[PDB]
Amino acid sequence: AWKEKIRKKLKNEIKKKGRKAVIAW
Questions:
Q1: CB of 12 closer than 8 Å to CB of 4
Q2: How far apart are CA 1 and CA 25, in angstroms?
Q3: How distant, in Å, are the alpha carbons of 1, 4, 18 from that of 25?
Q4: CA 1/CA 11 separation, integer angstroms
Q5: What is the 3-state secondary structure of 1-25?
Q6: Domains of the chain, residue spans
Q7: How far is the C-alpha of 7 from the C-alpha of 19, rounded, in Å?
Q8: Cβ density class 1-25: b for 16+ within 10 Å, e for less
């Protein structure tokens, strides 16, 4: 999916890391 459209980290960390664009900034 996408971390479930985003949410498999749990939150997906909220999204990744938050998109990891929130880490990938």
A1: yes
A2: 22
A3: 22, 21, 9
A4: 14
A5: CCCCCCCCCCCCCCCCCCCCCCCCC
A6: 1-25
A7: 11
A8: eeeeebeeeeebbebbeeeeeeeee
